[PDB]
């Protein structure tokens, strides 16, 4: 399996380790791990275009979007490659992430290797919020923690 990992860090208490596994290069990516230091509820969760951490999470740029589409949820045809939707933190502040996605890859043009995984302040509205922002970022708000996605063993 190609395997990857992103270690999320930010200026606040949010931190975690997200694993990626893709046993077959033409199959889906499994995404799992823990994020702690979160407020309870839903948090936007995306792969952004750049693996650039020179100005914290800001320099990651927008959502990874090689096909130049509008923001959506991961179940939508109209989405960014990087749109993984939401993760859910429990009342103890821990999101135990478990996602499977067939649009991102660990190889090829849709590869997220060397790109930044970001967990956001608020819920991703999945492009249904009735404004321009909904259609670019899902209104998920500010970037709480991020990590460059790296090749793992």
- Number of residues counted as binding a second copy (CB under 8 A): 22
Instruction: Answer yes or no whether residue 63 interacts with Zn ion by CB under 5 A.
Output: yes
Nearest-angstrom CA–CA distance, 134 and 145? 21
Residue 46 is labelled as binding a ligand? yes
Report the partner that residue 5 touches, choosing among Zn ion, Cu ion, a second copy, none (CB closer than 5 to 8 A by kind). a second copy
Q: Does 81 bind Cu ion (CB under 5 A)?
A: no
Displacement of CA 89 from its chain's centroid (Å): 15
The whole-angstrom separation of Cα 140 and Cα 145 is 13
Contact indicator for 47, 93 with CB cutoff of 8 Å: no
Which CB, 26 or 55, lies closer to Cu ion?
55
Catalytic residue list contains 43: no
Cβ closest to Cu ion, residue 1 vs residue 67: 67
Q: Is 82 exposed, middle or buried (0-12, 13-18, 19+ CB in 10 A)?
A: buried
Residue 117: both structure tokens together: 């995984």
| Shortest separation between residue 127's beta carbon and a second copy, angstroms | 24
Q: Does 46 bind Cu ion (CB under 5 A)?
A: yes
> From the list Zn ion, a second copy, Cu ion, none, which binds 144 (C-beta under 5 to 8 Å, kind-based)?
none
Contact 148, 114 (CB under 8 A): yes
Q: Which residues are catalytic?
A: 46, 48, 63, 71, 80, 83, 120, 143
**Which residues contribute to the site for Zn ion (CB under 5 A)?**
63, 71, 80, 83
């Amino acid at each position: 399996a190609t395997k990857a990992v992103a270690v999320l860090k930010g200026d606040g208490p949010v931190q975690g380790i997200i694993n990626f596994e893709q046993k077959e290069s033409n199959g889906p990516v499994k995404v799992w791990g823990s994020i702690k230091g979160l407020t309870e509820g839903l948090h936007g969760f995306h792969v952004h275009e750049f693996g650039d951490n020179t100005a914290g999470c800001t320099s990651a740029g927008p959502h990874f979007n090689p096909l130049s589409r509008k923001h959506g949820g991961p179940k939508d045809e109209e989405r960014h490659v990087g749109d993984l939707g939401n993760v859910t933190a429990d009342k103890d502040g821990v999101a135990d992430v478990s996602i499977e996605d067939s649009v991102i890859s660990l190889s090829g043009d849709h590869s997220i290797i060397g790109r930044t995984l970001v967990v956001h302040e608020k819920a991703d509205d999945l492009g249904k919020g009735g404004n321009e922002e909904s259609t670019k970022t899902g209104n998920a708000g500010s970037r709480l923690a991020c990590g460059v996605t790296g090749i793992a063993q």
